[PDB]
Amino acid sequence: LKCNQLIPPFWKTCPKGKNLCYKMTMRAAPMVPVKRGCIDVCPKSSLLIKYMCCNTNKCN
């Protein structure tokens, strides 16, 4: 599995046992996926911050 990076097509390889891709967005303004990488489990949505979790190549 590999995920995206922020702006640049650097992508970001997932380490073993950490094979989601997330992108962290705002609840108030999910315009910019401001944080990005691979995670063990789904980071959960909050009031101020939203996620989308997945598992696909250059998903996120």
CATH number at residue 54: 2.10.60.10
CB distance 14 to 35 below 8 Å: no
Cα four-point dihedral sign 32, 35, 38, 41: negative
Token output for 44: 């959960």
Residue 22 CA to residue 37 CA, distance in Å, equals 6
Cα radius of gyration rounded to whole Å, the chain: 11
Q: What are phi and psi of 3, to 5 degrees?
A: -115, 175
In the chain, how many domains are there?
A: 1
Q: Taking phi first (over 0 means left), then psi (-120 to 50 degrees means alpha), and beta for anything else, what does residue 42 get?
A: beta
- Decide if 48 contacts 26 (C-beta within 8 A): yes
Which domain does 57 fall in, by range?
1-60
Q: Is the distance from CB of 3 to CB of 54 less than 8 angstroms?
A: no
| C-alpha to C-alpha distance for 27 and 55, rounded to whole angstroms | 22
Q: Are 22 and 43 in contact (CB under 8 A)?
A: yes
